[PDB]
Design an enzyme around this catalytic site. Structure first.
Site, mmCIF file in Angstrom:
data_model
loop_
_atom_site.group_PDB
_atom_site.id
_atom_site.type_symbol
_atom_site.label_atom_id
_atom_site.label_comp_id
_atom_site.label_asym_id
_atom_site.label_seq_id
_atom_site.Cartn_x
_atom_site.Cartn_y
_atom_site.Cartn_z
ATOM 1 N N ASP A 335 -39.556 -23.569 9.168
ATOM 2 C CA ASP A 335 -38.106 -23.296 9.289
ATOM 3 C C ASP A 335 -37.473 -23.062 7.918
ATOM 4 O OD1 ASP A 335 -35.577 -22.996 10.605
ATOM 5 O OD2 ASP A 335 -35.627 -25.056 11.440
ATOM 6 N N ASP A 395 -29.225 -21.123 16.994
ATOM 7 C CA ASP A 395 -29.611 -22.245 17.833
ATOM 8 C C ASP A 395 -28.900 -22.273 19.180
ATOM 9 O OD1 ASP A 395 -31.110 -22.979 15.609
ATOM 10 O OD2 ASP A 395 -30.101 -24.887 15.278
HETATM 11 O O1 LIG Z 1 -32.975 -29.297 11.351
HETATM 12 C C1 LIG Z 1 -33.741 -28.847 12.480
HETATM 13 C C2 LIG Z 1 -33.158 -27.585 13.140
HETATM 14 C C3 LIG Z 1 -31.673 -27.532 13.213
HETATM 15 C C4 LIG Z 1 -32.414 -26.610 12.321
HETATM 16 C C5 LIG Z 1 -32.489 -25.135 12.643
HETATM 17 O O2 LIG Z 1 -31.099 -24.654 12.941
HETATM 18 C C6 LIG Z 1 -33.569 -24.769 13.765
HETATM 19 O O3 LIG Z 1 -33.243 -23.405 14.139
HETATM 20 C C7 LIG Z 1 -33.505 -25.752 14.885
HETATM 21 O O4 LIG Z 1 -34.354 -25.357 16.035
HETATM 22 C C8 LIG Z 1 -33.931 -27.155 14.361
HETATM 23 O O5 LIG Z 1 -35.390 -27.078 14.127
#
Ligand SMILES: OC[C@@]12C[C@@H]1[C@H](O)[C@H](O)[C@@H](O)[C@H]2O
Ligand SMILES: [Mg+2]
Length: 533
Positions: A335, A395
């Site tokens: 990420d 998200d």
């Molecule tokens: O911090 C974990 C988190 C919020 C950040 C991110 O925006 C990701 O796209 C999410 O699915 C999570 O893994």
């Protein structure tokens, strides 16, 4: 014949026509060809010197354009090019909005590709330069940004295609097939199912709650059991746990003892100002005027970017992901990858995109061919060929998001929009990840109809299906939605009206496990109508 609109285009400053050309300018040289392909034209070649921000194409701006942000979370949507107003950019998240923020603060920007009714303009790769379009005084201009890097010898241009046909979805699909070929895309034959902790527990996940879900997951059709952000003591310190978690290795062993593929979240190009790794290695980060350059602010801390031009950094990445592989992890959600591509000072005078690619290539080598890599928060084109799956929207959330604007804050409604508008990358660039299904009946404001709408759209689109819930709280309805979703997988989807501005979309998919299907979805009314043959 050409077309009046094609005679009106300029390629590297010259009037458009088929042929082979040399531009010798003060500080750079370009050698390029303009060649006919199926459905249009391809511009390719090679460049040396200091190309800077290199103009590739210029043409009259269309009224309505489908624009694309460079990374997972940013929008892909139709905008009015003549009434565009520059956004205020959040100083804590500057680089998710743009890798060239000087553009975005004054003009409309689209990264990698842009579309209008009947026409796609798209770059096939981002290996050295960042390819993007701007609308500058009513004109659409394509650029390759080389970030002030100098090239003694020729390097390849990122190829540009200009495609025309009245079927705009067909053009977007062709574009994406060409991108997959140019980059040796990975399109897994098998799509994982699984569980993710994030969208129920967030940072408050405990190992006790994790174990409870691990037992219940045996009654659900999950292959992967993935731990998200919560387990780690600090950003960058990925093998140091906090709270009630055991060791990262022990987590893997419990998960595998219980019959699941272990999965784990990291943000591998990020190190916070408080982390052990940053405090041990202050030299390991991208810099501005010789000091650490903030890449973004999150978790109420300054976060810095690892300088992926440094061999010490690439060795640390290799050893980390090698260690994780030895522990038994075989699913990796990686990420905030945009951090590795921020503009700035690095040890070697390479582009941020070149640096980025060295970092993700190192991760793939370390985890091996038998591990699944899921990209997130990531530049899209530079990751094709490396990742197996990719998050392609902002998200989701256990709520529709009535008062959430189309700004990047969590909301199921905007996460779903992106799965729709980027659908054409699926099974061409990688597997699209539309973000997790949320199917619980308590601790949510989603209605049964909203859960259906989200889940069935993701199924028709053949996207990855990962569930994120306290599994205690999922009952008959949530179970039925997951079963019926998985029945809609396996087809070739098309969004028929990709230039829609009212958030109603007609979507077909041929050859699913339920035959030919069609879903009409309306993201304003929150309704759907699904037909299966
Ligand atoms: O911090 C974990 C988190 C919020 C950040 C991110 O925006 C990701 O796209 C999410 O699915 C999570 O893994
Ligand atoms: Mg498929």
């Amino acid at each position: 014949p050409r077309g009046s609109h094609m005679a009106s285009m300029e390629i590297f400053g010259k009037t458009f026509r088929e042929g082979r050309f040399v531009l010798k300018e003060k500080n750079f040289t370009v050698e390029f060809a303009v060649e006919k392909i199926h459905l249009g034209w391809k511009i390719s070649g090679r460049v040396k010197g200091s190309p800077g921000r290199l103009e590739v194409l210029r043409t009259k701006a269309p009224e309505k354009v489908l624009v694309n942000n460079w990374q997972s979370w940013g929008p892909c949507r139709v905008v009015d090019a003549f009434s565009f107003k520059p956004p205020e950019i959040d100083p804590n998240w500057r680089y998710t909005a743009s890798v060239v923020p000087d553009v975005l603060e004054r003009n409309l920007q689209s990264d990698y590709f842009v579309a209008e009714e009947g026409k796609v303009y798209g770059f096939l790769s981002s290996k050295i330069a960042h390819p993007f379009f701007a609308v500058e005084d009513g004109e659409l201009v394509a650029y390759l940004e080389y970030f002030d890097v100098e090239f003694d010898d020729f390097v390849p241009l990122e190829p540009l295609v200009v495609l025309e046909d009245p079927n705009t979805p067909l053009l977007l699909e062709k574009y994406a097939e060409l991108v997959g070929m140019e980059n040796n895309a990975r399109v897994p034959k098998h799509t994982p199912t699984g569980w993710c902790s994030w969208y129920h527990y967030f940072l408050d996940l405990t190992w006790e709650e994790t174990l409870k879900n691990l037992k219940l997951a045996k009654n659900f059709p999950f292959e992967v059991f993935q731990i998200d952000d919560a387990y780690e003591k600090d950003i960058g310190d990925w093998l140091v746990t906090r709270g009630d978690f055991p060791s990262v290795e022990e987590m893997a062993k419990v998960i595998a003892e219980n019959g699941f593929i272990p999965g784990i979240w990291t943000a591998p190009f990020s190190v916070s100002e408080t982390s052990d790794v940053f405090n041990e290695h202050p030299d390991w980060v991208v810099k501005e005027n010789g000091e650490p350059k903030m890449a973004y602010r999150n978790w109420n801390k300054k976060i810095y970017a690892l300088d992926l031009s440094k061999d010490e950094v690439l060795n640390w990445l290799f050893d980390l992901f090698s260690s994780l592989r030895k522990m038994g992890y075989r699913y990796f959600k990686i990420d905030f990858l945009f951090a590795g591509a921020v503009p700035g000072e690095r040890k070697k005078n390479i582009t941020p995109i070149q640096a980025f690619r060295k970092g993700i290539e190192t991760i793939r080598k370390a985890v091996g061919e038998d591990s699944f890599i899921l990209g997130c928060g990531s530049p899209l084109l530079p990751a094709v060929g490396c990742v197996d799956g990719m998050r392609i929207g902002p998200d989701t959330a256990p709520f529709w998001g009535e008062h959430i604007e189309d700004n990047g804050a969590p909301a199921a409604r905007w996460a779903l929009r992106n799965a729709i508008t980027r659908y054409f990358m699926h099974d061409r660039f990688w597997l699209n990840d539309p973000d997790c299904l949320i199917l619980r009946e308590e601790k949510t404001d989603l209605t049964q109809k909203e859960k259906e709408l989200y889940s069935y759209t993701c199924g028709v689109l053949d996207n990855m299906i990962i569930e994120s819930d306290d599994l205690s709280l999922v009952r008959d309805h949530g179970k039925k939605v997951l079963k019926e979703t998985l029945e809609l997988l396996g087809g070739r989807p098309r969004v028929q009206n990709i230039m829609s501005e009212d958030l109603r979309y007609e979507i077909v998919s041929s050859g699913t496990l339920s035959g030919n299907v069609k879903i009409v979805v309306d993201l304003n009314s929150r309704e759907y109508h699904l037909e299966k043959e």
